[PDB]
Design a protein around this ligand. Structure first.
Ligand SMILES: *[C@@H]1O[C@H](CO)[C@@H](O[C@@H]2O[C@H](CO)[C@@H](O)[C@H](O)[C@H]2NC(C)=O)[C@H](O)[C@H]1NC(C)=O
Ligand SMILES: *[C@@H]1O[C@H](CO)[C@@H](O)[C@H](O)[C@H]1NC(C)=O
Ligand code: NA
Length: 205
């Protein structure tokens, strides 16, 4: 038998719920090599040119699948069929689903407090991409204080979601600080308590 990758599946419909979508499709021929699994890909209005995997290796017996959707986003999906020869061209993309705003569901990862020079303290974190913003006017709220009884938190709003640090200067060398980096948007601060990270001014811990 002469084999080839499968034909593009036909996306037949979609159901858009508040926090999930059910995508439906019909395979269109396996060109003589049984379909092994499907991949459901998705793109958003934030990064429309990027197609990322919503789910890989979806069973060959499924003709529909439920995928989770994050708050404040528009999503369109497409399906690719795979057989031993390889991947089929993608199906046409689905109609879009729009999700409503909510508070952020996480705070930034990799929070570090460390000086780069003797008398400063640099607080850094990994920026959260737009799909994690969850509502308009997303910003980071950075707080810090010396680990001294009665010391008050000093705070700073960072409205640039791509910014990954703040530099605090005129600090004593090698002293301890308690630090927090919280995600906040129009709906409120995130629903997960941020970890109080221990940091040190100067270059040593
Ligand atoms: C996901 O990517 C597709 C393109 O691969 C987007 O579809 C294009 O959208 C523009 C309008 O923004 C149309 O003018 C083009 O004709 C589109 N056509 C398709 C046929 O490719 C789609 O809008 C993107 N999804 C989201 C949510 O941005
Ligand atoms: C969704 O698409 C509409 C229409 O293009 C746009 O006005 C809106 O900004 C988009 N929303 C998000 C969260 O990307
Ligand atoms: Na989101």
């Amino acid at each position: 038998i002469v084999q080839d990758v499968p034909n593009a599946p036909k996306l037949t419909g979609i159901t858009c719920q508040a926090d999930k979508a059910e995508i439906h499709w019909e395979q269109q021929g396996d060109n003589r090599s049984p379909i092994l699994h499907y991949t459901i890909q998705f793109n958003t209005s934030f990064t429309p040119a990027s197609w990322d995997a919503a789910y890989e290796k979806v069973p060959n017996t499924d003709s529909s699948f439920v995928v989770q959707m994050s708050p404040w986003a528009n999503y369109t999906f497409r399906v690719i069929a795979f057989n031993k020869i390889g991947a089929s061209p993608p199906s046409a993309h689905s109609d879009s689903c729009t999700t409503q705003p909510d508070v952020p569901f996480k705070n930034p990862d990799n929070v570090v407090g460390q000086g780069t020079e003797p008398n400063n303290l640099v607080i850094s974190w990994t920026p959260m991409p737009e799909i994690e913003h969850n509502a308009p006017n997303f910003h980071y709220y950075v707080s810090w204080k010396r680990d001294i009884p009665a010391a008050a938190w000093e705070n700073n709003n960072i409205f640039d979601w791509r910014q990954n640090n703040i530099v605090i200067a005129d600090q004593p060398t090698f002293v301890k600080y308690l630090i927090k980096v919280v995600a906040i948007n129009d709906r409120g601060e995130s629903n997960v308590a941020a970890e109080e990270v221990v940091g040190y001014s100067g270059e040593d811990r």
